[PDB]
């Protein structure tokens, strides 16, 4: 019983069991309300789906009232378990503390204790919160996001019909100083569990040397429309557990983005991964802006196509297209000027 | 002997302008920025807006811009000599450096980005259209002004005799400027007269100049006196940088370049942090922490997202350098 065996059951032509999901703090109400406006205007009014909001602290009454008014579909508020937002018993907190203090000015969120709990949460726990149990699909939405174009079709229905497992917009190279031992830990896991490496994996996106080293490319997780059953699979559960035991979420600053990406690219047949070239999106500081004129004009996009990050050198659109055998847009090189 | 400040004090309505370097492909982001500037300060305190571009502007672009801006607008194209390889830079070596760094750091493989950094460092302040002004306010596309600004900022700078004003500060990625600090210190060693006796070196270094802590003012937002850049100290500093080759052999940004100059060549009380101006340039915010300022100016940002005192920001280093008292809850930004 393979990884795909846990996922294919979610592929009848009924309405998919899906939700939007947001991990946010009370101090981010204004940015969150702004993201809701985009989601509501660009797609939720047309194809309504429940929205789940999670917080490590309780939501204020003002926050809930404001969100309930802004969202036209059903909203659900949940707080996460202490066990999913605390140091595991095997982690040396004095050591973690030293690492943070030392890295405070060395890289973004280097000195942040809470950022690491967030990365660990998005890597191994959000997908098993009680509020997501009844769903097969989720669409992660962060605060301060923009949806630049109309989306005139149900995306969850589309993923279900086309049997896609993981969908993304932006991709980028990670700062290695943030994940020095993530690749080694991940490669050791594969060597130990060969059955988990899909024979038609997307290793080419993650590495230029057949897996010897990581090229640092990953899908930018702030935007994800994927199948919850991937994370619930034995393969991923065991992968997370291994990472959790190694200590990188706290001894380094492992993000959930490279973690989710390494898993998706290695545990799935590559044709289960999908790039939404048609969804206009902005998460500071990068844009995904539809390059196709018809798609751009038909969906009234509000972005500057020339600012699409996809084919910029530091993005990983080129690596993704080549690994998937996708034909790149004619003027893709213009983005490398 | 005339000093750096002697070139600036005579400039103390001000002859000021907004200035933007933009490409035709960023029209929607620019119009958005314009709407913000108009709504938060320009209709109340109008000042001319200068738009620069290394290529000619499209008619559609100019038309849209002319009508979106309430004050006078001016369009200018950049001199070819302010946007091309100087004759002493080895282009194949630069080409190799770019091809190599392409996937290594943001803009690593970009040729245009380097000409842009070099332009903001040594040439925008000498463009024909800026000659008549003493002050400028740099505005980039895709910006937000979160709050109303109820005073004329240029006038304020003038009356308070401030030379360089900023909002966001950050630590630079060292891989883009490996030899910038040594080059700058060698310049100061050879030109001790340009180092102001009461400078802000402590903002740039934790060890009195031995090493660069990488802190810099984020140049996307600047309200300053053009006479600092037109001073002999800066002209000679930029020329030294230009001949060293870092704009092309590394990836020297104008932000650290402007910052090193401002922090070493001026008395520190000539630098000013606008704690009251709400601003966003992807992906960092400056959101007024003071309650009265926030409410009175109808700010639209999340205060808890203010970048100023976050670890990777240089707000702490800045306040400490100027002897400014940090807000009581500054540590919460480091959680
Ligand atoms: C959980 O994690 C914690 C945290 O890491 C573990 O504790 C740490 O354990 C390591 C061992 O693995 C200890 O290392 C030894 O450190 C001493 C020096 O100790 C001083 O410096 C420390 C480092 O300072 C830097 O970092 C801090 C903060 O990050 C900065 O502020 C500084 O500026 C520095 O950058 C510092 O942390 C220590 O502070 C502690 O003690 C002081 C009092 O002294 C207190 O005020 C503090 O609050 C705090 O309590 C301290 O100041 C080294 O000397 C040791 O090196 C010897 O051994 C090495 C090999 O083992 C060898 O390579 C060295 O050369 C050296 O050996 C020499 O001497 C030998 C004996 O004579 C000779 O035989 C040999 O030939 C050679 O000549 C060693 O590196 C940490 O100190 C310790 N930290 C703390 C806070 O306890 C903890 O073990 C983990 N818990 C578990 C269950 O695993
Ligand atoms: C300009 O830069 C190029 C590229 O670095 C130099 O080309 C040489 O570089 C190496 C010698 O140091 C060797 O690889 C070759 O001799 C040659 N390589 C190339 C690019 O073909 C070149 O010498 C530099 N020119 C000057 C005047 O220094
Ligand atoms: Cl930070
Ligand atoms: Cl790039």
Swiss-Prot record, chain A:
Pathway: Protein modification; protein glycosylation. It is an enzyme of class 2 (transferase). The active site is at residue 224. GO terms for cellular component: fungal-type vacuole membrane; Golgi apparatus; Golgi medial cisterna; Golgi membrane. The keyword Transferase applies. Its cofactor is Mn(2+). Mannosyltransferase that transfers an alpha-D-mannosyl residue from GDP-mannose into lipid-linked oligosaccharide, forming an alpha-(1->2)-D-mannosyl-D-mannose linkage. Required for the attachment of the third mannose residue of O-linked saccharides. This is Glycolipid 2-alpha-mannosyltransferase. It comes from Saccharomyces cerevisiae (strain ATCC 204508 / S288c) (Baker's yeast).
